[PDB]
Every structure is written in C-alpha cells, then in structure tokens.
Amino acid sequence: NVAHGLAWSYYIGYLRLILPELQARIRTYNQHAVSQRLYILLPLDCGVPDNLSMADPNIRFLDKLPQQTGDRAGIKDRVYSNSIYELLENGQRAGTCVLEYATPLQTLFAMSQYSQAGFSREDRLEQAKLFCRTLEDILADAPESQNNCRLIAYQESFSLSQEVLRHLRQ
Amino acid sequence: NVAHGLAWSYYIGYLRLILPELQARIRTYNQHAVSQRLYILLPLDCGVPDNLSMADPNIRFLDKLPQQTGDRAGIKDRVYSNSIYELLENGQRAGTCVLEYATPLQTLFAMSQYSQAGFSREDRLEQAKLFCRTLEDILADAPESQNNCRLIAYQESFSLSQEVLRHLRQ
Numbered sequence: 160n161v162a163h164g165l166a167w168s169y170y171i172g173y174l175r176l177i178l179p180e181l182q183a184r185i186r187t188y189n190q191h192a193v194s195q196r197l198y199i200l201l202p203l204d205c206g207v208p209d210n211l212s213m214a215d216p217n218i219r220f221l222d223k224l225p226q227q228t229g230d231r232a233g234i235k236d237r238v239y240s241n242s243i244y245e246l247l248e249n250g251q252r253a254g255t256c257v258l259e260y261a262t263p264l265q266t267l268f269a270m271s272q273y274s275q276a277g278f279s280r281e282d283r284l285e286q287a288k289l290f291c292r293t294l295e296d297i298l299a300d301a302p303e304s305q306n307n308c309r310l311i312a313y314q315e316s317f318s319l320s321q322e323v324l325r326h327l328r329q
Numbered sequence: 330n331v332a333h334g335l336a337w338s339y340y341i342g343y344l345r346l347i348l349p350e351l352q353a354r355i356r357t358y359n360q361h362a363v364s365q366r367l368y369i370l371l372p373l374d375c376g377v378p379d380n381l382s383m384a385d386p387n388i389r390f391l392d393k394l395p396q397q398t399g400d401r402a403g404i405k406d407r408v409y410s411n412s413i414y415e416l417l418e419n420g421q422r423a424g425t426c427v428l429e430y431a432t433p434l435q436t437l438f439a440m441s442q443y444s445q446a447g448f449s450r451e452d453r454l455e456q457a458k459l460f461c462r463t464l465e466d467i468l469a470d471a472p473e474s475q476n477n478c479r480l481i482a483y484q485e486s487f488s489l490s491q492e493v494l495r496h497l498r499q
C-alpha cells in the first residue's frame with residue numbers, strides 16, 4: 160500500500176505542476192530538436208542511479224531546461240529543474256528528450272533497507288508494479304497529461320537507451 | 330496508512346539530505362543571527378499555505394539560504410532551497426530561523442479532494458497525526474537529526490508566530 164501514496168505524491172507534488180508548463184519550457188529551449196514529452200523511467204527493480212549516464216553510456220546528458228520556480232509550503236522560489244539527454248545508437252544521435260527516473264522508486268528501495276520502515280525487501284517488486292499501475296491510472300484521467308509524458312517501465316544483455324528509443328520512435 | 334509512506338518519503342528524499350549540510354549552510358549565511366535548527370510546521374488540519382506570511386503577518390520572509398544541489402534520479406543539479414524568516418512580536422524582531430511547512434501535508438489534503446485517491450476527507454486529521462507520529466519516530470533514532478530540526482505540530486484567537494517563538498525560546 161505504500162506505493163499508492165507515493166504515486167499520488169509523485170503527481171500532486173510534481174507531475175501536475177511541471178507537466179502543464181513543460182511544453183512552454185521545451186519550446187523556449189528549442190528557440191535558444193528536443194521532443195515535447197517528459198520521459199519517465201520506472202525500473203521495476205527500483206535501482207535508480209543518480210547519474211543517468213552510468214546506467215548506459217549511450218545516454219549523454221546535454222543540458223538543463225529553463226528552471227521553473229514557485230513558492231511552495233513556505234519555500235520562496237522552490238526550483239523544479241529537468242535535464243535534456245541525447246540517445247546514441249551506433250555512434251549516431253538517435254534522439255533527444257527530457258528524460259529522468261521516477262524518484263519515489265528510490266524511496267521504495269530505501270524504505271526496504273530500513274527495518275523501522277516495516278517494508279520487506281521481498282516486496283520491492285510488487286510495490287514498484289503497484290506504483291506504476293497507480294501512476295498510469297492517475298495520468299490516464301488527468302488534464303495535465305495531455306500527451307505530455309510517457310512512462311517507461313521495464314525489467315532487466317539489455318539496453319535501456321534502446322528502451323527509450325523504442326517509445327521515442329513511436 | 331498513506332501517511333506512513335509520506336513520512337518515510339519526507340525523510341529519505343529530504344530531511345536526511347539537507348539536515349547534514351544545513352549547519353554549514355546557515356554558518357555561511359551568518360558570515361555573509363539565524364538560529365541553527367530547521368523549524369518544520371505541521372498543521373494538523375493540513376492547511377499548508379504556500380506563502381508563509383499569509384498565515385500570520387508576524388512572519389516575514391527575509392532571505393534564501395545558499396542553495397544545495399546534487400544529481401538525483403537523473404536530474405543534473407537538483408536544487409534544495411530554504412527560506413529564512415523573522416518572527417515579530419509587538420513590532421520587535423523576536424527571532425530568526427529557517428522555517429517551513431512540511432510539504433507532504435499538502436499531499437494529504439490534495440489526496441482527500443480526489444475521489445480516485447481512495448482517501449476520505451474525514452481521515453485528514455488522523456493521517457496528519459500519523460504523519461507527525463511517524464516522522465518524530467524516524468527523527469528520534471536518526472543520525473541526521475543531531476539537534477538539527479524541531480517539529481512544530483499544532484491545532485487551530487491563535488498566533489502561530491507565537492507558536493514558533495515558543496519552541497524558538499526553548
């Protein structure tokens with residue numbers, strides 16, 4: 160059940176705030192092409208490396224988008240920032256996108272290690288699936304998600320660069 | 330049960346990252362006095378205004394701390410920023426601190442309005458209490474919380490500026 164609140168946290172505190180202003184943020188960057196969707200990686204093993212290039216050398220960080228900021232819960236100018244990556248394939252620039260892991264999967268993996276969290280390591284995968292399932296339902300019936308992001312869930316030769324390219328080509 | 334994952338999310342994804350580097354961040358600001366603890370507001374009604382001055386005119390935003398940034402889940406240079414407030418009392422500067430609401434309480438209040446979230450409005454208060462109770466337990470046995478933050482839970486004439494001052498004077 161923990162994954163449930165995390166998916167809803169993931170949407171209320173993020174997806175529903177940056178998704179509406181995301182097209183305008185890519186358009187700016189293009190007119191100093193980055194594709195217009197926010198690609199979200201959901202590894203079901205919940206292994207979420209912080210540096211995306213260490214998961215695959217064919218994913219190269221290129222730049223940051225223009226920051227988005229707002230006052231939130233008493234923090235003046237809270238900062239939402241997103242990175243642009245190029246996807247390479249046989250030495251060729253095959254695509255460019257705003258690409259990133261779903262952070263809460265890291266929370267699930269950290270909750271598993273702490274004994275005080277009452278969350279067993281065996282349950283990581285079932286909660287990862289529940290997290291994806293719930294988030295896909297939240298986005299299916301959401302105004303914010305008007306074709307703004309694509310969830311990339313996968314299980315682990317294996318190329319993830321290829322995985323992103325698969326959905327990117329679609 | 331949703332509050333449980335939120336408290337653990339609140340710690341793994343925030344408290345345990347900024348708390349260790351918080352003393353060093355205040356010390357910098359002092360040597361261009363801000364008190365050395367991170368004061369976290371937990372309204373049990375889960376009403377979390379974004380601008381802290383609209384909850385009480387005696388809380389005046391003063392400045393931002395030096396930002397803290399790191400690579401996280403594929404975002405290059407993710408930004409953690411915190412605001413410094415002065416607490417006034419009969420026109421007098423009575424205190425200065427890094428003060429802020431616990432954001433997840435906003436998630437609880439948003440989850441209550443959405444029917445798809447399976448979270449009734451009657452349960453807001455019980456989950457707010459469960460959120461505070463869990464977070465107080467996580468911090469009690471935490472290395473990060475070596476006298477770094479004070480939880481300010483309250484229920485609602487009433488002065489909150491006075492509330493913060495109470496714990497501040499201690």
Ligand SMILES: Nc1nc2c(ncn2[C@@H]2O[C@@H]3COP(=O)(O)O[C@H]4[C@@H](F)[C@H](n5cnc6c(N)ncnc65)O[C@@H]4COP(=O)(O)O[C@H]3[C@H]2F)c(=O)[nH]1
Pocket residue numbers: 168169170171172173234237238239240261262263266338339340341342343404407408409410429431432433436
């Ligand atoms: N004042 C303050 N508080 C913070 C901060 N960072 C974390 N917190 C606290 O910790 C909770 C869990 O953080 P998380 O583990 O990163 O999970 C996040 C993440 F998955 C995504 N997200 C949000 N901003 C993003 C960004 N900028 N990039 C990527 N992703 C993001 O939405 C979740 C919930 O976001 P919420 O805010 O609703 O709840 C948060 C909040 F209470 C911070 O900079 N300043």
